[PDB]
Amino acid sequence: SSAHKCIDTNVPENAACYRYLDGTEEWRCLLGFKEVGGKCVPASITCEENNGGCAPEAECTMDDKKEVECKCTKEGSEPLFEGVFCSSSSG
């Protein structure tokens, strides 16, 4: 939905932003970038640090393409912005 699109946050370059229904807005760097001094700069990622950039609730791995993959294992939640964010699911 569009209810999740940020509307009151200055989003850094190379970052994603998610607006929660309670009005909260949070941004995070896109896969491949690391937060350095309030900015998202290019970096060499490793699932062993900050979960590879994947959402805290996601699983980080390496596929055949030797690239990072984020998956929201919970049944009901999906990966937004390639998994930088994991949708929330009903109970």
Side-chain angles (χ1 to χ4, degrees), residues 14-32:
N14 300 309
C17 189
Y18 184 78
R19 178 180 178 79
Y20 296 83
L21 263 31
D22 76 354
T24 303
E25 303 201 329
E26 153 184 27
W27 60 264
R28 299 172 183 175
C29 296
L30 300 173
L31 298 191

PDB file of all heavy atoms in Angstrom, residues 14-32:
ATOM      1  N   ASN A  14      20.638   6.352  -1.578  1.00  0.00           N
ATOM      2  CA  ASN A  14      20.902   4.916  -1.424  1.00  0.00           C
ATOM      3  C   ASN A  14      20.363   4.331  -0.112  1.00  0.00           C
ATOM      4  O   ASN A  14      21.028   3.581   0.605  1.00  0.00           O
ATOM      5  CB  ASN A  14      22.391   4.636  -1.564  1.00  0.00           C
ATOM      6  CG  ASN A  14      22.922   5.062  -2.891  1.00  0.00           C
ATOM      7  OD1 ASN A  14      22.376   4.706  -3.971  1.00  0.00           O
ATOM      8  ND2 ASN A  14      23.995   5.824  -2.832  1.00  0.00           N
ATOM      9  N   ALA A  15      19.107   4.656   0.165  1.00  0.00           N
ATOM     10  CA  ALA A  15      18.433   4.186   1.364  1.00  0.00           C
ATOM     11  C   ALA A  15      16.971   3.956   1.035  1.00  0.00           C
ATOM     12  O   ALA A  15      16.442   4.485   0.049  1.00  0.00           O
ATOM     13  CB  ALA A  15      18.571   5.235   2.473  1.00  0.00           C
ATOM     14  N   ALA A  16      16.325   3.159   1.875  1.00  0.00           N
ATOM     15  CA  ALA A  16      14.918   2.856   1.708  1.00  0.00           C
ATOM     16  C   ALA A  16      14.280   3.412   2.951  1.00  0.00           C
ATOM     17  O   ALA A  16      14.940   3.533   3.980  1.00  0.00           O
ATOM     18  CB  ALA A  16      14.714   1.351   1.652  1.00  0.00           C
ATOM     19  N   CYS A  17      13.001   3.748   2.853  1.00  0.00           N
ATOM     20  CA  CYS A  17      12.261   4.284   3.984  1.00  0.00           C
ATOM     21  C   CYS A  17      10.914   3.595   4.065  1.00  0.00           C
ATOM     22  O   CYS A  17      10.249   3.386   3.050  1.00  0.00           O
ATOM     23  CB  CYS A  17      12.051   5.782   3.826  1.00  0.00           C
ATOM     24  SG  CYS A  17      11.374   6.566   5.316  1.00  0.00           S
ATOM     25  N   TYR A  18      10.518   3.236   5.279  1.00  0.00           N
ATOM     26  CA  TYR A  18       9.249   2.557   5.501  1.00  0.00           C
ATOM     27  C   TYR A  18       8.425   3.339   6.522  1.00  0.00           C
ATOM     28  O   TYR A  18       8.942   3.742   7.569  1.00  0.00           O
ATOM     29  CB  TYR A  18       9.501   1.153   6.040  1.00  0.00           C
ATOM     30  CG  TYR A  18       8.259   0.302   6.218  1.00  0.00           C
ATOM     31  CD1 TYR A  18       7.645  -0.308   5.119  1.00  0.00           C
ATOM     32  CD2 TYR A  18       7.697   0.106   7.484  1.00  0.00           C
ATOM     33  CE1 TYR A  18       6.509  -1.092   5.267  1.00  0.00           C
ATOM     34  CE2 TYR A  18       6.551  -0.679   7.648  1.00  0.00           C
ATOM     35  CZ  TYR A  18       5.965  -1.279   6.530  1.00  0.00           C
ATOM     36  OH  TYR A  18       4.855  -2.081   6.672  1.00  0.00           O
ATOM     37  N   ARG A  19       7.153   3.560   6.207  1.00  0.00           N
ATOM     38  CA  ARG A  19       6.263   4.262   7.108  1.00  0.00           C
ATOM     39  C   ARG A  19       5.345   3.247   7.747  1.00  0.00           C
ATOM     40  O   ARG A  19       4.601   2.561   7.050  1.00  0.00           O
ATOM     41  CB  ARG A  19       5.415   5.288   6.357  1.00  0.00           C
ATOM     42  CG  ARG A  19       4.429   6.017   7.278  1.00  0.00           C
ATOM     43  CD  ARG A  19       3.590   7.050   6.531  1.00  0.00           C
ATOM     44  NE  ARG A  19       2.619   7.717   7.401  1.00  0.00           N
ATOM     45  CZ  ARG A  19       2.906   8.707   8.246  1.00  0.00           C
ATOM     46  NH1 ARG A  19       4.147   9.176   8.359  1.00  0.00           N
ATOM     47  NH2 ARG A  19       1.937   9.238   8.974  1.00  0.00           N
ATOM     48  N   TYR A  20       5.401   3.147   9.071  1.00  0.00           N
ATOM     49  CA  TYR A  20       4.553   2.216   9.809  1.00  0.00           C
ATOM     50  C   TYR A  20       3.182   2.857  10.003  1.00  0.00           C
ATOM     51  O   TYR A  20       3.071   4.080  10.015  1.00  0.00           O
ATOM     52  CB  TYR A  20       5.175   1.913  11.172  1.00  0.00           C
ATOM     53  CG  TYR A  20       6.507   1.210  11.091  1.00  0.00           C
ATOM     54  CD1 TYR A  20       7.683   1.932  10.893  1.00  0.00           C
ATOM     55  CD2 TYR A  20       6.592  -0.176  11.210  1.00  0.00           C
ATOM     56  CE1 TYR A  20       8.912   1.292  10.820  1.00  0.00           C
ATOM     57  CE2 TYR A  20       7.817  -0.833  11.141  1.00  0.00           C
ATOM     58  CZ  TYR A  20       8.973  -0.091  10.947  1.00  0.00           C
ATOM     59  OH  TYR A  20      10.194  -0.718  10.916  1.00  0.00           O
ATOM     60  N   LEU A  21       2.146   2.040  10.160  1.00  0.00           N
ATOM     61  CA  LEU A  21       0.789   2.555  10.351  1.00  0.00           C
ATOM     62  C   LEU A  21       0.656   3.524  11.532  1.00  0.00           C
ATOM     63  O   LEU A  21      -0.177   4.432  11.488  1.00  0.00           O
ATOM     64  CB  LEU A  21      -0.191   1.392  10.511  1.00  0.00           C
ATOM     65  CG  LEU A  21      -0.975   0.931   9.274  1.00  0.00           C
ATOM     66  CD1 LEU A  21      -0.166   1.161   8.012  1.00  0.00           C
ATOM     67  CD2 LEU A  21      -1.352  -0.537   9.420  1.00  0.00           C
ATOM     68  N   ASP A  22       1.467   3.355  12.577  1.00  0.00           N
ATOM     69  CA  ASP A  22       1.373   4.270  13.718  1.00  0.00           C
ATOM     70  C   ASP A  22       1.996   5.624  13.388  1.00  0.00           C
ATOM     71  O   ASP A  22       2.084   6.495  14.247  1.00  0.00           O
ATOM     72  CB  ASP A  22       2.032   3.671  14.969  1.00  0.00           C
ATOM     73  CG  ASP A  22       3.527   3.731  14.921  1.00  0.00           C
ATOM     74  OD1 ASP A  22       4.067   4.138  13.869  1.00  0.00           O
ATOM     75  OD2 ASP A  22       4.158   3.367  15.938  1.00  0.00           O
ATOM     76  N   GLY A  23       2.437   5.795  12.144  1.00  0.00           N
ATOM     77  CA  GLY A  23       3.018   7.069  11.737  1.00  0.00           C
ATOM     78  C   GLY A  23       4.536   7.150  11.773  1.00  0.00           C
ATOM     79  O   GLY A  23       5.136   8.102  11.274  1.00  0.00           O
ATOM     80  N   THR A  24       5.158   6.146  12.374  1.00  0.00           N
ATOM     81  CA  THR A  24       6.607   6.087  12.485  1.00  0.00           C
ATOM     82  C   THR A  24       7.236   5.900  11.112  1.00  0.00           C
ATOM     83  O   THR A  24       6.707   5.166  10.275  1.00  0.00           O
ATOM     84  CB  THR A  24       7.021   4.894  13.369  1.00  0.00           C
ATOM     85  OG1 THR A  24       6.405   5.018  14.656  1.00  0.00           O
ATOM     86  CG2 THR A  24       8.522   4.841  13.541  1.00  0.00           C
ATOM     87  N   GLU A  25       8.358   6.569  10.874  1.00  0.00           N
ATOM     88  CA  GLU A  25       9.053   6.424   9.605  1.00  0.00           C
ATOM     89  C   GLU A  25      10.495   6.089   9.919  1.00  0.00           C
ATOM     90  O   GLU A  25      11.141   6.755  10.723  1.00  0.00           O
ATOM     91  CB  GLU A  25       8.996   7.708   8.760  1.00  0.00           C
ATOM     92  CG  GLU A  25       7.583   8.202   8.469  1.00  0.00           C
ATOM     93  CD  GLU A  25       7.493   9.128   7.267  1.00  0.00           C
ATOM     94  OE1 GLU A  25       8.457   9.870   6.988  1.00  0.00           O
ATOM     95  OE2 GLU A  25       6.437   9.120   6.604  1.00  0.00           O
ATOM     96  N   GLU A  26      10.994   5.041   9.291  1.00  0.00           N
ATOM     97  CA  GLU A  26      12.360   4.619   9.495  1.00  0.00           C
ATOM     98  C   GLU A  26      13.038   4.384   8.152  1.00  0.00           C
ATOM     99  O   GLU A  26      12.421   3.860   7.217  1.00  0.00           O
ATOM    100  CB  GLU A  26      12.374   3.331  10.327  1.00  0.00           C
ATOM    101  CG  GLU A  26      13.586   2.451  10.090  1.00  0.00           C
ATOM    102  CD  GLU A  26      13.536   1.130  10.862  1.00  0.00           C
ATOM    103  OE1 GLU A  26      12.430   0.643  11.164  1.00  0.00           O
ATOM    104  OE2 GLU A  26      14.605   0.558  11.154  1.00  0.00           O
ATOM    105  N   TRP A  27      14.294   4.799   8.035  1.00  0.00           N
ATOM    106  CA  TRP A  27      15.012   4.544   6.802  1.00  0.00           C
ATOM    107  C   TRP A  27      16.178   3.628   7.118  1.00  0.00           C
ATOM    108  O   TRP A  27      16.631   3.568   8.258  1.00  0.00           O
ATOM    109  CB  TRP A  27      15.517   5.833   6.132  1.00  0.00           C
ATOM    110  CG  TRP A  27      16.464   6.660   6.954  1.00  0.00           C
ATOM    111  CD1 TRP A  27      16.145   7.736   7.733  1.00  0.00           C
ATOM    112  CD2 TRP A  27      17.890   6.522   7.028  1.00  0.00           C
ATOM    113  NE1 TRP A  27      17.279   8.276   8.286  1.00  0.00           N
ATOM    114  CE2 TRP A  27      18.365   7.550   7.875  1.00  0.00           C
ATOM    115  CE3 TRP A  27      18.811   5.618   6.475  1.00  0.00           C
ATOM    116  CZ2 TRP A  27      19.726   7.719   8.164  1.00  0.00           C
ATOM    117  CZ3 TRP A  27      20.168   5.781   6.766  1.00  0.00           C
ATOM    118  CH2 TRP A  27      20.608   6.822   7.610  1.00  0.00           C
ATOM    119  N   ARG A  28      16.636   2.900   6.104  1.00  0.00           N
ATOM    120  CA  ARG A  28      17.754   1.975   6.233  1.00  0.00           C
ATOM    121  C   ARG A  28      18.441   1.971   4.893  1.00  0.00           C
ATOM    122  O   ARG A  28      17.801   2.223   3.864  1.00  0.00           O
ATOM    123  CB  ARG A  28      17.267   0.565   6.543  1.00  0.00           C
ATOM    124  CG  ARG A  28      16.493   0.424   7.823  1.00  0.00           C
ATOM    125  CD  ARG A  28      15.906  -0.961   7.942  1.00  0.00           C
ATOM    126  NE  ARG A  28      15.105  -1.098   9.146  1.00  0.00           N
ATOM    127  CZ  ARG A  28      14.399  -2.177   9.463  1.00  0.00           C
ATOM    128  NH1 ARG A  28      14.386  -3.231   8.656  1.00  0.00           N
ATOM    129  NH2 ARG A  28      13.710  -2.198  10.598  1.00  0.00           N
ATOM    130  N   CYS A  29      19.739   1.692   4.894  1.00  0.00           N
ATOM    131  CA  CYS A  29      20.492   1.676   3.650  1.00  0.00           C
ATOM    132  C   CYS A  29      20.089   0.488   2.771  1.00  0.00           C
ATOM    133  O   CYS A  29      19.715  -0.563   3.275  1.00  0.00           O
ATOM    134  CB  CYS A  29      21.987   1.622   3.956  1.00  0.00           C
ATOM    135  SG  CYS A  29      22.671   3.082   4.828  1.00  0.00           S
ATOM    136  N   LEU A  30      20.140   0.664   1.457  1.00  0.00           N
ATOM    137  CA  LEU A  30      19.796  -0.422   0.537  1.00  0.00           C
ATOM    138  C   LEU A  30      20.918  -1.460   0.525  1.00  0.00           C
ATOM    139  O   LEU A  30      22.048  -1.169   0.925  1.00  0.00           O
ATOM    140  CB  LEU A  30      19.619   0.122  -0.875  1.00  0.00           C
ATOM    141  CG  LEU A  30      18.547   1.181  -1.088  1.00  0.00           C
ATOM    142  CD1 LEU A  30      18.649   1.699  -2.513  1.00  0.00           C
ATOM    143  CD2 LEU A  30      17.165   0.586  -0.807  1.00  0.00           C
ATOM    144  N   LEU A  31      20.614  -2.663   0.049  1.00  0.00           N
ATOM    145  CA  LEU A  31      21.628  -3.709   0.001  1.00  0.00           C
ATOM    146  C   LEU A  31      22.844  -3.194  -0.759  1.00  0.00           C
ATOM    147  O   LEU A  31      22.713  -2.600  -1.833  1.00  0.00           O
ATOM    148  CB  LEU A  31      21.084  -4.972  -0.678  1.00  0.00           C
ATOM    149  CG  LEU A  31      19.904  -5.666   0.004  1.00  0.00           C
ATOM    150  CD1 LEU A  31      19.693  -7.018  -0.633  1.00  0.00           C
ATOM    151  CD2 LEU A  31      20.179  -5.845   1.493  1.00  0.00           C
ATOM    152  N   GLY A  32      24.023  -3.402  -0.186  1.00  0.00           N
ATOM    153  CA  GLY A  32      25.226  -2.953  -0.846  1.00  0.00           C
ATOM    154  C   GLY A  32      25.754  -1.655  -0.287  1.00  0.00           C
ATOM    155  O   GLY A  32      26.834  -1.224  -0.672  1.00  0.00           O
TER     156      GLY A  32
END
